[PDB]
Point group: D2
Chain length 390, copies 4
């Protein structure tokens, strides 16, 4: 199978999915409690760490499983999400960081490569859990200031940092302010002075994903723990943002799958044969889920092809990767919640009590809409700009 | 204004809405806490009781405000629901019971009239809070058994009984089992032996509505506290079920209104002018909300006209009332959640944290789908049967 | 019945609908031929003229039937449209002109009143068939130029002028160019020199509606055949544009009704009982048609109420009338074509051959989308401007 | 590119698409006239015949181009459909017959192989144009009767036979009636006595596709021109029906593409920058078209994989092929017409006149809904049966 995210397409992808199977039963078992209490499943992550799955996307050269297709990462996230979407969303941050650090390792200058290499062997060993602090909190602009002696001091606050509760290393999007301002990616470790992880995530869904705020109060960062980016429009950069986020589409596809599976099981348990409207819903969902899978799957296949090809116009490459990502994302964010919603009509009133799985899937399935890049309102400006050559 | 539920159409309806205004600020203020904890707002109901609003739909002959249009009851529920939908849903059970007891009073035999009259002056006084126990729990069929001395013993369990926590009187749908079986409406009071109110409502939404189970363990009911119904298809009965439930459409209309109002306020608070997709969403919502209001409003106007006219074929009357109700209900249950959902796209990520009002409106707005009569799957069998003359 | 356009709400409205019934059978009978050939049904209009129905909306003071509610005009258009939508669309231009000329008659200065009065008794007599030339063709800006002796010369070209083939009088939106420019409504009669009616309408639907272009080549117009308007934003003018166009919503409602009626008749003719998907479609359509009727009906009731009340802020009055019109129009233009489309799924492949009635209804039902004011793209700018107080 | 039908995936597929390019300009040029008059473009087909493209899917062993992927056939149909959908729909019947005859040739008994081989070299040479007469007209059940001397006589009538006007050979689905009844595929040639091609296709769309009825009045068919099928449920047969029809999804995808391309060109031609609603429509269409392509493309890739694998349970193989086909078909038949419809909103009123390309695309895009297998109502019974293991 090379379509619909039905199966991994490479040998490493298969091993990844086989190894994950052992962990599914714990993931499913504790999901309801962590959602109710809003707490991160630290024990699931301890098991994945010692089992080496936290290094799944580290290059085999460095001792990792060598998963290097986005498509296979999404197939694994989908399987995890059918068990618990919060765990999948947190796992995606680790897996996709494996992929972009792997590219720094192979194409960065010596500073990037050395640093990337250290983190990547960390990930395999179980010692490095890598979170991404991307979006500034509204009270703050996260800035790096020279320390006077050749290093830096980082101040600010980032929001919505998933997996933060077990994070050991945090890649932070910041700008300088000591040249003219440049974008920089300092890496802060958890024991850096001035560094606090807050405990303030209270989600409608993704309740267990640890999607908290992190605060930097003059955190000393040494020069070789900073990847300087640039200044300045640069489309080629869209490619890294795609690699960073596109596989997360597997999460919302798995949520829709688990809703459908729940609804069908419910219908089969009944003495009465399904009513006319239930048969029609089932057929409509079956086809919508197919179109959901085919759309995520194809944009993932296309993204993997463009990702592997470095031989051309890098700006065109980044626009094309982002256009595949965004076209598919908008479709996913409309289809997945529609499917989940229609599933509640099949099960009926039992799905409206707080503990039923569908009631949680209805909350978790909404989270994709708000994840940048891009939320709906911004996606429409991006897409119409690209389509009309603005 | 005679359309869209924009304003009450009778003098008593206006008084009702004016008097409710005093209570809105407490209702809005405590909504978040009661949703979080899942607890019934007993203090709001204490205030409505002593203010006489719990008698709003009692005939003026008996000292009530004399609200007798469904349309005006829905206009009042809408205003309450913009403050808190759980409170509105519970209030609807009291108000619509005012209307069906008022019909028992004017058209019942002497047993019904006497009993109805006692309860109705109760409601005005603040002493009677009347809940409806309609749907059997799956473990039980609620049955009335003769006690050997001319009275009855009631056993069973009813589910989803809103307002039960403050209920003093419970109208219960039961069947006999001492003739051949008949449908009977015994009225049980809270201090009857064998009668328990459970504390088991844990909703995805409508969390504060007190929608709990109630249990009957050989509850002694005297003969004059039982309204015997019949055996046996009887379409005329559809009219009472319509009167009982149709005004609750105002609840879901108010939820959609409060979502839109929230979204618009959010857009106006921003320094930036809205993006192209936000302007288009606003226009689409504005028109969808209009169609939502016009559909609920017209079915309520039509229901009031048919309700008042007793001069014809009573079976045709009941089919027509139920057809207006069900056509409008299906539209309401698709339009209202769509509006609320689109509102989250306007506000963006802040609406996905557990405390934001939209996150609660998204949960509460789903409840209409599951309320009988009829849930989606059964509505489709009813409607296609009527349209095709089956 | 006061809702859903199910029945006229005034005695004159009832007479109008009763009198129209005689003409329905010819209208239905010739519809297919006129659609195929693209030709205007001149014989239907000859019959309506001599029967006096072309004066239905002329004040009884002047010998007309005195229909003065938009709601009743829409109920009559709906009945005509179930027979043929092109005939209804052309009839709407006559009927609504009855209403706006009736307002000129009662509130214009002596020039307007005298002219309005002459035309209105024309309409009753069968001698005046009044078309509206509103939109400039792209090659031309229709301008009135003083003739040097106290009258005017009209040049330009208007497009999409329905009913033009039998039109005797044409109210034309023009601007002066002899003060500073003003808007003017010259009335041109068919025998004016320089005046040509073209024969260039080739519609996907509304094929028989005579929606042709008309050309003015220095047409001499006397001063008392010109209603001068103003210069300059003026919201009060929205009220006349609403009166002019809002009742045409009945046309698209009748098209949806005739599609549903066709589909249901088709299902009842079959030996087999309907499949599960057909029962579900029937219920969905039944409810969508209800919401369609309730939305058009309520905006028509609201428009009639605001129309009759001249006692207040005239600018607020015009914004409110247009907002009711536009909210309802957007809903109508999405719901009506959806219903018609779903009807083809019920009938199946027979509805895809050129002669089946549904194939024509699918074409005619699209025309509302393109009629100003406002087409979809402009409606969204109007509605979001009003909702956000821009 | 291996997704979205953006490009053929094999060398023969590329040659096919390159060779077709020469013919596109005539196809586009004559489309409007053939739609207006309802006439088959015999000259386009004469050119494809002599150019050998009518043999594109004949095995290279027999002198054909050897196109053997459904995916590449759909990529070619899409390119043709952007020029004219009727021509594509007719071409699909020839191309897919290349594929199922190619399977008879390689896996049939000697009767099938010999006959298949003769026809297939015909197709390459330009001498054989192969139509499929599948669906019985309602007045007739098409039956083969033994002629008493070892051959057969064919009577009946088939409907909706596309390409019939230039057809030289007609594969007919029939049942015997001389054992117990069996299904048989007699092949009738155009000069057989008793064989008439009628001239009765009058479509809302696909007007030029020659989709006429054909009549058999005791047509003598020799025994070696009959492929006997079986009696009796047999799921394995679903695989041939899939191969026969699945590539036609490319037709409706090309129609949606040509609508979008038209709309975008229209927006770019305007002096004014697009309004807020137009930008939002453009982004929504861009994403819907992506999901349309990804869904058709993936079901075509999956169908090609299952088609090539003959090594397993043949009944499971046929259920899986048909399930991919039907899931995708239902999505295509909702997405493609929605896109085309939204395109008319972008262009506005010009798209409602009979000659504008969008007005034709709106008609042609509806045809997929009615093509078996399966039309919507039957697809829902098939899909819900498969999903619920009925
Ligand atoms: C350009 C490019 C970058 N990357 C990786 C290397 C960088 O670490 C990373 C940048 O990702 P991200 O942080 O999402 O981009 P930004 O810095 O714009 O927020 O992406 C790829 O994996 N592939 C690529 O083609
Ligand atoms: C027949 C009818 C009943 N009613 C009232 C009187 C009865 O108390 C009540 C029955 O309502 P309900 O309990 O909803 O009906 P059922 O007994 O079928 O569950 O409805 C009306 O208000 N109007 C009517 O026309
Ligand atoms: C202001 C107003 C005008 N009218 C009528 C009188 C004018 O003849 C007519 C103007 O309609 P119309 O031609 O649609 O407006 P415009 O001149 O802006 O195109 O509307 C009403 O019927 N009611 C009103 O309240
Ligand atoms: C079983 C099978 C048949 N075919 C071809 C061989 C037969 O000629 C043809 C039957 O197609 P079709 O006529 O669509 O099936 P039916 O006879 O049920 O109408 O399909 C394949 O191409 N692949 C297959 O796997």
């Amino acid at each position: 199978s090379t379509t619909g995210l039905y199966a991994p397409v490479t040998p490493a992808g298969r091993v990844l999915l086989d190894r994950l199977a052992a962990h599914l039963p714990r993931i499913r078992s504790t999901a309801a409690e962590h959602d109710r209490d809003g707490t991160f499943p630290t024990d699931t992550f301890d098991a994945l760490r010692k089992d080496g799955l936290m290094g799944a996307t580290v290059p085999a050269e460095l001792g990792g499983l060598g998963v290097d297709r986005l498509y296979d990462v999404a197939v694994a996230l989908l399987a995890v999400a059918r068990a618990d979407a919060s765990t999948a969303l947190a796992l995606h941050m680790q897996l996709s960081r494996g992929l972009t650090l792997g590219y720094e390792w192979r194409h960065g200058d010596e500073r990037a490569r050395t640093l990337a290499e250290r983190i990547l062997r960390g990930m395999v060993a179980g010692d490095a859990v890598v979170c991404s602090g991307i979006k500034d909190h509204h009270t703050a602009v996260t800035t790096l200031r020279p320390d006077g002696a050749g290093g830096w001091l980082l101040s600010g606050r980032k929001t919505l940092v998933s997996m933060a509760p077990v994070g050991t290393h945090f890649v932070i999007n910041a700008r300088t302010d000591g040249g003219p301002p440049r974008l920089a990616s300092p890496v802060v470790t958890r024991d850096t002075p001035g560094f606090t992880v807050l405990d303030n995530w209270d989600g409608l869904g993704m309740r267990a994903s640890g999607t908290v705020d992190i605060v930097f109060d003059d955190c000393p960062i040494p020069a070789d723990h900073v990847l300087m980016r640039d200044p300045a429009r640069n489309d080629a950069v869209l490619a890294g943002q795609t690699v960073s986020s596109v596989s997360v589409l597997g999460v919302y596809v798995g949520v829709a799958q688990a809703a459908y599976d729940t609804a069908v099981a419910a219908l089969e348990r009944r003495p009465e044969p399904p009513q006319a409207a239930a048969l029609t819903l089932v057929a409509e969902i079956d086809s919508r889920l197919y179109a959901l899978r085919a759309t995520a799957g194809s944009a993932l296949t296309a993204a993997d092809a463009l990702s592997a090809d470095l031989s051309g116009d890098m700006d065109e490459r980044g626009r094309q990767m982002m256009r595949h990502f965004q076209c598919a994302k908008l479709a996913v964010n409309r289809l997945a919640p529609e499917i989940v919603s229609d599933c509640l009509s099949l099960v009926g009133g039992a799905s409206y009590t707080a503990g039923h799985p569908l009631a949680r899937l209805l909350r978790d399935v909404q989270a994709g809409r708000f994840m940048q890049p891009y939320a709906y309102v911004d996606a429409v400006d991006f897409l119409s700009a690209q389509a009309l050559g603005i």
